[PDB]
Design a protein around this nucleic acid. Structure first.
Ligand SMILES: *P(=O)(O)OC[C@@H]1O[C@H](n2ccc(N)nc2=O)CS1
Ligand code: NA
Ligand code: NA
Ligand code: NA
Ligand code: NA
Ligand code: NA
Length: 317
DNA sequence: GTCGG
DNA sequence: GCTGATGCGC
DNA sequence: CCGACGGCGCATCAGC
């Protein structure tokens, strides 16, 4: 599955410059679509024309592939990689909270590196400071073992605040994956429905700060919390990395739609979405009509009440 | 940049 | 001060 | 040729 990796690296490299430097998000997704269709292609590509056959690979990406195969490089990438301005803008967006627009502004003012960021705490907002502070940790994957320990803590403390909460760690983790990029937790409580927040999210966040699991807050409102956490390590062991954790308060009757959605995979979702006359979003499933007019959303008490309706487990996905 | 109305 | 627009992460 | 390409919660900015 690494058979066109040079081609795939190139395309992802091009993708990020469109996103972070050119600010062309559709070009970004075009290069990424092209990269992943190629990454799944079971042969070593020999020509751009061979690749052009795949959906998401067009004439310009096929030309690029021909230049890359003939020379092992792309003049445009070589060039843009040398460029002080653009390289810097690209790199700074790796800090969580620095998007393409903040990156450009910093580089305009001569702030180009992490050091530069450090020397100017004042010019960054809260999220950006936390992303700087944990820059290295956030780029690390989380082994399954550590996620299990993190899960242990979350369920214990959620249940302790109130035994009637229901919390589920979603993401790749729930799919059995050997590692994860962060922790996505979905939270509900029987007294929170589509027509209902009484500090339900807040008092959970607070409990996990109280036992020193949550260490920082990127953002926090009534339904979505974004922050940082860390496992305790014993007296004379090296610290675990700081880790990203999100917690979502969803109403009881949308939980399982939410669960499914944040369970992923992104691939299987977009897939089963289009796959019959039903439409699905993170919240609900609605039946259509003639034009395609969504009727009222259907009740749900489980994940598998949804595997009724298209005639369609997380292990697989 | 690629697709498709 | 308040409303809506934009930036951002995912 | 020429528009679609994803949408939503929170923080923060621009404007009144
Ligand atoms: P994060 O990287 O934790 O992804 C998990 C969930 O998937 C959904 N998702 C992923 C990527 C993007 N671009 N958009 C998106 O909605 C929601 S968070
Ligand atoms: Na641009
Ligand atoms: Na094609
Ligand atoms: Na960023
Ligand atoms: Na995730
Ligand atoms: Na992730």
């Amino acid at each position: 599955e690494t058979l066109n990796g040079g081609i795939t690296d190139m395309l992802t490299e091009l993708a990020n410059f469109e996103k972070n430097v050119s600010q062309a998000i559709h070009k970004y997704n075009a290069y990424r679509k092209a990269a992943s269709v190629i990454a799944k292609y079971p042969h070593k590509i020999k020509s751009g024309a061979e690749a052009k056959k795949l959906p998401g690979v067009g004439t310009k990406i096929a030309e690029k592939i021909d230049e890359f195969l003939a020379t092992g490089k792309l003049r445009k990438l070589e060039k843009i990689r040398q460029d002080d301005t653009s390289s810097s803008i690209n790199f700074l967006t790796r800090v969580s909270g620095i998007g393409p627009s903040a990156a450009r502004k910093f580089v305009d003012e001569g702030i180009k590196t992490l050091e530069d960021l450090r020397k100017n705490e004042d010019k960054l907002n809260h999220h950006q400071r936390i992303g700087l502070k944990y820059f290295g940790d956030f780029e690390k994957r989380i082994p399954r073992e550590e996620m299990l320990q993190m899960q242990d803590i979350v369920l214990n403390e959620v249940k302790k605040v109130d035994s009637e909460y229901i919390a589920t760690v979603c993401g790749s983790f729930r799919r059995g994956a050997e590692s994860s990029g962060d922790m996505d937790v979905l939270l509900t409580h029987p007294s929170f429905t589509s027509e209902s927040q009484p500090k339900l999210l807040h008092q959970v966040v607070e409990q996990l700060q109280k036992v020193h699991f949550i260490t920082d807050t990127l953002s926090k409102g009534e339904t979505k919390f974004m922050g940082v956490c860390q496992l305790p390590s014993k007296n004379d062991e090296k610290e675990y990395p700081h880790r990203r954790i999100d917690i979502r308060l969803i109403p009881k009757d949308q939980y399982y739609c939410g669960v499914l959605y944040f369970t992923g995979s992104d691939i299987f979702n977009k897939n089963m979405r289009a796959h019959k006359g039903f439409t699905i979003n993170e919240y609900t499933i609605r039946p259509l009509g003639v034009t395609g007019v969504a009727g009222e959303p259907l009740p749900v008490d489980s994940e598998k009440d949804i595997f009724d309706y298209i005639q369609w487990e997380p292990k697989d996905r």
